[PDB]
Design a protein around this ligand. Sequence first.
Ligand code: NI
Lengths: 260, 266
Amino acid sequence: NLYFQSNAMKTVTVRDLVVGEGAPKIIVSLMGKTITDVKSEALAYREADFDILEWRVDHFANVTTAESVLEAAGAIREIITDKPLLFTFRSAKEGGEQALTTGQYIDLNRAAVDSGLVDMIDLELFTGDDEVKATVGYAHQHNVAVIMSNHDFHKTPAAEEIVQRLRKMQELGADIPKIAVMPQTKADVLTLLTATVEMQERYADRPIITMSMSKTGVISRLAGEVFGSAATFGAVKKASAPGQISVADLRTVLTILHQA
Amino acid sequence: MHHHHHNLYFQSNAMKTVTVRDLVVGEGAPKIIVSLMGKTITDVKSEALAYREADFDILEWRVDHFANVTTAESVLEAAGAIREIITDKPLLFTFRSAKEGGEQALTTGQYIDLNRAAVDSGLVDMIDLELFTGDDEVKATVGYAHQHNVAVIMSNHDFHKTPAAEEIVQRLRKMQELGADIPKIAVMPQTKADVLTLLTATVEMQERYADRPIITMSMSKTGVISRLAGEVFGSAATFGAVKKASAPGQISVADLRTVLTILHQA
Ligand code: NI
């Protein structure tokens, strides 16, 4: 599992994929309740064009059973063999389907890191600073990269607050700070982009991932190359968050912008 | 002082649209404008015939590239040629002055007389008038175009910097005050933030002050996204390239229509 990190070039390289270089990378979210459902979805996703596979563990029914989680991850790794695998338990208040105690959520990520089956984990910043910092270090001890994340599905904080949150993620050791916000106005989309630019140019020594959700915020999913967001989420069969477009349409736009 | 004894465009203030040759500017996905440049009447004809096959909505004739811009009748001969060739799309007459990057310079009197001649001809559906021409002549010429059912795109360009958002909004508002049917502004980013400043101005103008469509763009490769996001931010049209870009940042019409269509999906 070794991944690379170049602070000077602001890149994170996982499975030969250079996040932070060139056109933004496409992340898709795989959801399945049972082990066989995860296999089925992995076989379907193997036919799609994406760069990073995110397993949304909060959609899995047996999330507190260690052996079941490990079996599902192994199944994905056996089907999708050449793309980085990102392990994400999204909490209900951050956009997901389930909620765990802080301890259960650490056990779960701990076990994912230990297995060697996943290349990256997602850690929610709000989990708690001590908890998060320790877990980041642990992931790094095992050659697992961390996407640190924060999501607001109702509003867009001020740009200064968005920047500060991305700076803290970096301070806590996130390899890739990530923030998703919801616009209530057209200007809010621009606020998210402003924060992206400011963070990326003034403070980051690594890639960042940002997005303004809903149809109104779609542009933020497409303009990463210019504004400084290193990856973007697309939909394979169904959108996992408001505003995602199909992977095919997303790749089309990213390519056009890259070659403009 | 212009008098009529005893072209057609529509505009809806409340819907914020301008309709010319059945094209509804301000509704749905942004419209694509392409620019035709030719030095002689022979070059204009060859380029119009060639462009006829392209996917665009509005044809802009860049009169400043024409060598014989000095005798109005000669300019009207080329306009007729384009009108005979492109019969079903709006034709925008644009002499882009030396002050704003035009390949040429003309005195204000010559510029006003050229645009009056274009209006008189009935061969063009719209004229471009530069905001910075001078208020008395702009107002008079806007009124003159309107008397003839010719729409006006009022324009302003900065190829070296992006003014503050407030200044961009003031210019768009002034265009509306002067009677422009479609205010239009193009600015050049020096930083990534400058691209966002142009979009901020677009949103504020469109939401708070406009009762008509506006056209805005941040030039260069850096500003390309501004040419693509008009549906959400409020820019009603966008310039594309048929064979070669006519301003920095334009992409091919095929790529532009592809992206616009994706963004319009719902
Ligand atoms: Ni008359």
